[PDB]
Symmetry: C2
Subunit: 79 residues, 2 copies
Amino acid sequence: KQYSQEELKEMALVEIAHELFEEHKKPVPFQELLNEIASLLGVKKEELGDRIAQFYTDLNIDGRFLALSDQTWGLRSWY
Amino acid sequence: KQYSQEELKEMALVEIAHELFEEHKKPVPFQELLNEIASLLGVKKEELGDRIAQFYTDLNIDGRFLALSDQTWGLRSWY
Ligand code: NI
Ligand code: NI
């Protein structure tokens, strides 16, 4: 990346998410984005709090992003 | 992993998917699973063909798996 933690700490979660996708180049579940973003800002996802519904909204507003129909799967023994 | 390509080539896609999740330990979009599985069998995803709706079905049948509500996102410039 071309951003420090301190630059990331100045960005909208949706601009962080955008650089992740440009690096990663893979679709990602919303919750995994939250984790990768929260780890790049060295906080706990829990702490993003009020920026979460903001982020969900921005992703929907901003034309660069698609919500894909593709189904997220996992193991029952993680929940 | 503890499987060769040749052992994987004998397994139901759903047992391959299960070992992926046990390694990876992350939720994954269905289509990314198809890619990781297709690359572990050195074929093109396209070639899994009739095993695809089989796999979708097995995931739904088999109690180890959850379909999570979490939304898959991506960039419009991949589609
Ligand atoms: Ni959008
Ligand atoms: Ni199931």
